[PDB]
Amino acid sequence: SFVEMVDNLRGKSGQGYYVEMTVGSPPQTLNILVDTGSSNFAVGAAPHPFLHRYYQRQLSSTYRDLRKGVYVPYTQGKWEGELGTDLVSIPHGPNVTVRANIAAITESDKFFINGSNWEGILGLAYAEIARPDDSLEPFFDSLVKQTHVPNLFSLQLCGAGFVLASVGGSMIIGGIDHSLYTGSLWYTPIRREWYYEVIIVRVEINGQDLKMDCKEYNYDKSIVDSGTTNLRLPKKVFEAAVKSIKAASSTEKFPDGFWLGEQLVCWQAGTTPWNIFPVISLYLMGEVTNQSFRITILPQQYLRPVDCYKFAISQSSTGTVMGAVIMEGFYVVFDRARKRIGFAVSACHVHDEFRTAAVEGPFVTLDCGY
Ligand SMILES: CN1C(=O)[C@@](c2ccncc2)(c2cccc(-c3cccnc3)c2)N=C1N
Numbered sequence: 559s560f561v562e563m564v565d566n567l568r569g570k571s572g573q574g575y576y577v578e579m580t581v582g583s584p585p586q587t588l589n590i591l592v593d594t595g596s597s598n599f600a601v602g603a604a605p606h607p608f609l610h611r612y613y614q615r616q617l618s619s620t621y622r623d624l625r626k627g628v629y630v631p632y633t634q635g636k637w638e639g640e641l642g643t644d645l646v647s648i649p650h651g652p653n654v655t656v657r658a659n660i661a662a663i664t665e666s667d668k669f670f671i672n673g674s675n676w677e678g679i680l681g682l683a684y685a686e687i688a689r690p691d692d693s694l695e696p697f698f699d700s701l702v703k704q705t706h707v708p709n710l711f712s713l714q715l716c717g718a719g720f721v722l723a724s725v726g727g728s729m730i731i732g733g734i735d736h737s738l739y740t741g742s743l744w745y746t747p748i749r750r751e752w753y754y755e756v757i758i759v760r761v762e763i764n765g766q767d768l769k770m771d772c773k774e775y776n777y778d779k780s781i782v783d784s785g786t787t788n789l790r791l792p793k794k795v796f797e798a799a800v801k802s803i804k805a806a807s808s809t810e811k812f813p814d815g816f817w818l819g820e821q822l823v824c825w826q827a828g829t830t831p832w833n834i835f836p837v838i839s840l841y842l843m844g845e846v847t848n849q850s851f852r853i854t855i856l857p858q859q860y861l862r863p864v865d866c867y868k869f870a871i872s873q874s875s876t877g878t879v880m881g882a883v884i885m886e887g888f889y890v891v892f893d894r895a896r897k898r899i900g901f902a903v904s905a906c907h908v909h910d911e912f913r914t915a916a917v918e919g920p921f922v923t924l925d926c927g928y
Pocket of ligand 1: 680
């Protein structure tokens, strides 16, 4: 029953959303980051200064060694571990237990976050991008193959809403909970099964078209990633977006350290002038070729609380990333079975009495992909 699954996520602002899981026998309780942007189930399995608990394979009667190592260097840092399998459950998820691959992390750099309260990562994306290669079946694939759970999951990330702010949300596995959203669910195709890749066909700031060749919005790809905090945009698009946002909020000036996403700005208790910042609309490709639908986000989503805030839109060199701050406005359905992603206005999204996040379509757009 989906009711048991409601509010099963927690986190700290800017530090990811995590769900409680158990690994091994007897069950070892760990908090695990819900990450649609990667494809390994990777868990701290050795002492680390930021870890207050970790996976102890020797304490597990059901652990099985794969006798194989894994090394994952990446932009921000790296992680390194040992492959095996064990029994895994999600206490506030489906009532099943699965045998899944587990990368036991033995060494890492800049991977874990101080005080985040999670000890591992659940990569929900596809095998194509699994480390060390695509033969290592990802968790969700094992779950679907081993149980009768429908090949779909959905995420309602709620954020903080009014010490880093604590956030909450829901991960519904195997279905769609109609109490978590209002209005219509609109679907955009999954272009390819590796990341959750999608196509953006245009973007507006306060109703004003950025007027770019749509290839620019997806250069070199566009993905939906619960494991990225910000909305990240390709250089050309980022610059155009900030120019427009700057002009919209011209009354009142901020330092470009703020626009560069590393400097906070503060008002005091309920004085924040939301009405000065514009809304942002991303139009996603519809299931029908010449159609699209728009998701519209507010400043309440793209100014992340830290009353202090940081600009949560930043530049990318690896394509558009629709991260947590974009997802927070919405109920997002990862319909793997039908190769599509749905968006509907979330029952929990933060907004004032003049504006609201929105999902609206269709818009007919009469080649946007990389
Ligand atoms: C972008 N991204 C990463 O860098 C990370 C990753 C996962 C697996 N191997 C390499 C990188 C990742 C790793 C650690 C922490 C985060 C993170 C940090 C802050 C907020 N929320 C997620 C993300 N997962 C995503 N999606």
